[PDB]
Amino acid sequence: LIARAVANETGAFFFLINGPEIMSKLAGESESNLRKAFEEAEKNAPAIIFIDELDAIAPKREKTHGEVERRIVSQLLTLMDGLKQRAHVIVMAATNRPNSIDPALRRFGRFDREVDIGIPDATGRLEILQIHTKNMKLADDVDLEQVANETHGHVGADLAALCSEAALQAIRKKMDLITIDAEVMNSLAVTMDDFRWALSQSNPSALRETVVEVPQVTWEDIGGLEDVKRELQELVQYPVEHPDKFLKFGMTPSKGVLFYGPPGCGKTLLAKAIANECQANFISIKGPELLTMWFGESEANVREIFDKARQAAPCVLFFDELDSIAKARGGNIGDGGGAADRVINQILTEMDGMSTKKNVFIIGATNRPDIIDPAILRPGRLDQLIYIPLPDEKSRVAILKANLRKSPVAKDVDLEFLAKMTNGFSGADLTEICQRACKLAIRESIESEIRRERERQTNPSEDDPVPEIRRDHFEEAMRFARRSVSDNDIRKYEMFAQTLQQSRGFGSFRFP
Amino acid sequence: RPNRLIVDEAINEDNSVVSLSQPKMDELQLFRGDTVLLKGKKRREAVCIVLSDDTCSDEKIRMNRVVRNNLRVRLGDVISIQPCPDVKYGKRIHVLPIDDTVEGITGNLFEVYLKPYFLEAYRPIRKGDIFLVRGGMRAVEFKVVETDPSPYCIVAPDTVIHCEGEPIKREDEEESLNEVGYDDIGGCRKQLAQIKEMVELPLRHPALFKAIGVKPPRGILLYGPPGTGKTLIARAVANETGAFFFLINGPEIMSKLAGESESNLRKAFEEAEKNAPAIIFIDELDAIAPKREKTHGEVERRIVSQLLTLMDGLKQRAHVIVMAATNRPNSIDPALRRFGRFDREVDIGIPDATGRLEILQIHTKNMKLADDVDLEQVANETHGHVGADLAALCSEAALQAIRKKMDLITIDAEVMNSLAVTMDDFRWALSQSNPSALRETVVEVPQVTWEDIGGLEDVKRELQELVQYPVEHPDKFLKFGMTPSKGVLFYGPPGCGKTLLAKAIANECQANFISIKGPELLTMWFGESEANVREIFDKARQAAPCVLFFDELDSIAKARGGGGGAADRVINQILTEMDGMSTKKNVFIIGATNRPDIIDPAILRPGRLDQLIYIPLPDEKSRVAILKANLRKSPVAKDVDLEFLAKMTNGFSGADLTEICQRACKLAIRESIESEIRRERERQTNPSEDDPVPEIRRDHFEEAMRFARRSVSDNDIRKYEMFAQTLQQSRGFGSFRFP
């Protein structure tokens, strides 16, 4: 669609080469078809030759077993090289991944410009839904924003299928009741019922794909930590907002930072917030992914990750648990080996090879800064160490408000008081309290609905019993509230930070 | 016009019964037994008895395939329903067999087929109607070429029921009942409904879809173990929708010479194009287009590319749906699963006990089974049987009966009808079964209920809140803006009903239940096949709503010692799959572990098995319920006081109570066998009855309690209680009151 739209809007002649179609033809006929396509593009220049499923024609040389396949790949390379004489003919080609095709095609003069379409974000999904529902008559009930937010893992073909499924659900509903009359279609409409049913029946095709998008988190979602906000700004926003200042003062922007602190205190929230403030893409590498690379010895994939971060820049590449592999080896005492491991070694290799001009910022997070490999805290690496402590009262209030944003909460509740009485609670604990309150409210609502329906059953002869989460709901939820971070863990983190700070003497330094 | 009604699938198998929804006969003013002359296409009339039912929709009329065919209508069509009081009885009806259906049956065809039909059953018969009599083990079609009070008559004992020989030739516009239909398919009612909803609109209303201008389903990939009748499903869908059916056989295509295979594929797609709307079924798709790695020759890749090209070119073909059969989604080239290709998918899977019973009824439909057989018992005992396996089992039972008859003794139909299969034959066939899907993962709604495990009311409430509420009240969760919990972790002494609890909660929500035992996790760990975890979750995703149960999450931790950390490859993959699990899908993860201490902490984080539920040893009421459930299928003397037995079994796990019940049952069996041996020995020594032990007596339970052991020591209970108390003590802040 992108290639055809570009050709149509620029007025260029569009020629489509389907890889499977080329490979379907007998030996020699594939070469003839490729040559004829390129000749036709030459004749109608300016032209765009779009090769769909390029990996079908020219996969990795290992995947090309037959001699005719290699001959076809060589013919494609020859045509790409001969483009030099072919006046203003551009060849676009679709592929699943850059490594899916023969590397010889990615050389200069051949497919050298590359664009990663990737997966649409919530805004992108909303745009796609609006495009595919343009003709569709939709009831005022449907808000495509909610569908876009809920359609994670969809690519656009998935969204088109979802819209078609909703339309067909509506048509099925209105078909048994009733060449076909367009008045029925105008009357026909789709509601959130149809769209939610389609969402339930939809099978996203890009759930495994890495998410690369600007996070919707903001500094308000995590109050307090103003000093951490300032440090993150200086380390991410300034190099991208004011490269001129860094050039003038001749400083190299820091490549990354390492968050350390109690679990579930908002390190991920902080990384997403700083990515959002700079409107930079955010890539999250969770601890399970690092452990998957370590167990499977797939540390090569680390390179791919960084490529992704390089491809979508400026970026905040976030490693949720850098100590995950260290813990998996024992961590506190570990095995007989040292702190170095294959996956973290590859991370260091990629960080060293990162061009600072690309504005890709690495943020590591760890609840065990002691067991992190020291080689990653060196200059030119995650040199800065930032302590993310347990949220303070203002931070707790902000976290509670952020959690209770999609939940209708009675004005009677004093979130300020609740935050006041939750000293020592991590953000995870506050989220647990809010979820418990929502659980109690939902249970009360369902029980009241059951009682009402039973009353109707016993008496054939309506308002929401509980439309909001009430003061009593939170009071009950606080009974199950627990502090996941004990005072001993806080002491450990405070001792680590104090050890780091004590070495920072020489503060009584003054020029003469 | 009230007479307009939509044809629908029948429940009752009678060929002259049309069911109607309860609020509709009154509107049309019927009498639950009145003769109604339904009108269909081609100016076809069929007179039938109108029954009543609840499941039927107000505007829907349930019709069996025979009445549908003689009315020249299909499911979803519109027919005119109106009473036919002028249905007076008749004197002579000239029925005649169809040539095809009696091609090899010799006999009277009356007192065997036409007599049991119409006997004590006043079936209204219209001239030209074709009715099916399923007797012996054939299904004979009989066409009424003449009735004395034409066109409609009622068969009565005072009727000639005249018939002759010379079977007539089936006319062009007659769809032989031997053709596959939805009634010929069992064990995939859910998947069959999915496929029907997918393909009915594009096929039943092609031009309406074209003017519609919305994307139709192009490729439907039915996977599941072989023998589940996927070809049967496709053929039935094509027949019931009137769509042209073209069968492409993978091996047949690959057998042809290079180029001839391409020509065959192209010609198949062209033929489907011509006779649109059409269904192209590609049986054994993996044969044509396996994983590219499996494909070696140039011709193989060329034929795969040709198939992809045809699938992509479907866009210009008039309402042609391509269905393909495969063992697993990964068995075929990934390029086939792209959009514009086999993007729609259905997992037929192995049938469940209900599905197995449906299949057995379908395959024994013609069989003149003895009254002794209860197909429910066979369906319950045929675990691991695909539809093909059950067909083979029914065939083997019939062959056993035929062999016995031949030993007692082109063939007379009377003895064939007399020939009856008994539960002895079915059990013999079950012994010589060799099911083909014993190792396939079982995905079904468990039959366990909360009654099988009494007590644990708080655990019942938690499980309900965590599983039933999100699937039964999504609106509430949306309103309150809560994300349903992804899963829970049961912990407690072994054999205390954790599996029972998971199965019970799955049953209450009528959700599929997938059990992953500790040996499976250890197999993935030892073989380093943790990738299989993904497949498991995929399966669970395919069967949503589902309760994915991990019986021993600590199995790998135990296998490692219970020097490294708690992380391991298999549990790491479980974490990865759980994180990538969309909460919109109602897949609920339940983990069970006798050793919560050695469980990887990463699994207990929010967004994972965050809730920890302690399943203690059964209390007295739970013990009574466990004893009752264990002995449900065992004849137990009324003298036994299960309440007293539960009272005296404090500290016993559910496994211990099951052991006691099994010990008593085995003692009773031993006593029965010894008494029978003694009785036959006496008969031999004194040739010269009643069951010596018809039930498990109280003495048997008293003897069994001698060997009764407490599998869970007080120290283990202390450990679990200490764990629970450590969890609880952290949950302070109870004295929190808003100002």
Numbering used by the authors:
A (entry chain A): 253 to 430, 436 to 718, 724 to 774
B (entry chain F): 22 to 430, 436 to 588, 593 to 718, 724 to 774
From the paper:
The AAA+ ATPase valosin-containing protein (VCP)/p97, known as cdc48 in Saccharomyces cerevisiae, is an essential and highly conserved protein involved in numerous cellular functions, such as regulating protein homeostasis, endolysosomal trafficking, membrane remodeling, chromatin regulation, autophagy, Golgi formation, and others. Previous studies have established that post-mitotic Golgi reassembly requires presence of VCP, as well as two adapter proteins, VCPIP138, and p4734,35. VCPIP1, also known as VCIP135, is part of the ovarian tumor protease (OTU) family of DUBs, an essential family of enzymes that remove ubiquitin tags from proteins to regulate protein homeostasis and function.
To stabilize the complex, we used BS3 chemical crosslinking prior to grid preparation and cryo-EM data collection. From this sample, initial 3D reconstructions revealed two binding sites of VCPIP1 on VCP. We obtained a consensus reconstruction of the VCP-VCPIP1 complex at an overall resolution of 2.3 Å (see “Methods” and Supplementary Figs. 2, 3 for details). To better resolve these regions, we used symmetry expansion followed by focused refinement, with masks focusing on the N- and C- terminal ends of VCP. Using TR-FRET experiments, we assessed the effect of nucleotides on VCPIP1 binding and find that the absence of exogenous nucleotide behaves similarly to the addition of AMP in the complex, suggesting our complex is nucleotide free in line with not observing nucleotides bound in the structure. We also observed that the complex is highly dynamic, including within the N-domain of VCP and throughout VCPIP1.
